[PDB]
Design a protein around this ligand. Structure first.
Ligand SMILES: Nc1ncnc2c1ncn2[C@@H]1O[C@H](CO)[C@@H](NC(=O)[C@@H](N)CO)[C@H]1O
Ligand SMILES: Nc1ncnc2c1ncn2[C@@H]1O[C@H](CO)[C@@H](NC(=O)[C@@H](N)CO)[C@H]1O
Ligand SMILES: [Mg+2]
Ligand SMILES: [Mg+2]
Lengths: 136, 136
């Protein structure tokens, strides 16, 4: 699993065209204030331990930043060892579930299987942009 | 070299704190309209052929998108096989030079060695977000 953590002042997204034949999540949009935006690429090796490591790390980083909202943003482009779309969606659902057991704030999972527009205003402080890798 | 191509409606950045002891580029800011924002991670293996492959690809993609502005945005987070900061800066300078020989529009190289704030509005069409890898 490869993640990119972006500490935003604001964030918003809108699904546009379906990127998959039948996206498993409905279309939609959302916007937010201050949040940790976690761009999330699910990789072949990812299973339940990977999900829980990533959940624990996201919660600790958010703790460090004093963030109270986390956006799990599906992202196909951080890795060249991608899981298949059904496995990725399953892992991302698991990740959202896992994160709720470790982090007390708002967790939002953006829909899976769509092309997106987004806007972000990413903060400039030293810990505002970081990447992570998890395996098992 | 690992790149992320984001076809933006708008883009802007501002240097904040120096991320290196002595950033080799002066502080600053810029904003843009429609552009291809190329987040660029220079890797250990990168040399002159890598630079030219990446220049040629950026020019072709921009051609496909009918983009007339390209932003070369230094980005430490796309890879876990990073070049050292001096080599990376040299490669990025070379990349800007190379791109000017293949692409007729505006090329802007964002400064190197800084923490940045940025804002992007990334388009939602199918080719608006893509990643690339170059080696030699
Ligand atoms: N291994 C993987 N990990 C995470 N997400 C994955 C995935 N495989 C497919 N997706 C999702 O399907 C869309 C098209 O690739 C992806 N959509 C996107 O990456 C948009 N942000 C592009 O505009 C994403 O929803
Ligand atoms: N191998 C590498 N490839 C590309 N850029 C590199 C690099 N090594 C260092 N940098 C630059 O130094 C800043 C701190 O890591 C980097 N700054 C950034 O990545 C900001 N966007 C963070 O806010 C970048 O300017
Ligand atoms: Mg809509
Ligand atoms: Mg300034």
């Amino acid at each position: 699993m490869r993640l990119l953590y972006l500490h935003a002042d604001r964030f918003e997204y809108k699904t546009v065209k379906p990127a998959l034949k039948n996206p498993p999540d409905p279309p939609g949009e959302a916007s937010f204030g201050e949040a940790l935006v976690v761009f999330t690429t699910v990789e072949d090796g990812d299973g339940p331990q990977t999900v829980m490591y990533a959940a624990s790390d996201i919660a600790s980083h958010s703790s460090r930043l004093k963030v109270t909202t986390v956006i799990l943003y599906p992202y196909a482009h951080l890795s060249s060892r991608l899981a298949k779309p059904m496995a990725a969606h399953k892992r991302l659902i698991e990740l959202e579930g896992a994160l709720r057991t470790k982090f007390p704030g708002h967790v939002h999972r953006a829909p899976f299987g769509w092309y997106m527009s987004f806007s972000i205003a990413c903060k400039g402080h030293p810990l505002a942009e970081l990447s992570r890798s998890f395996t098992e």
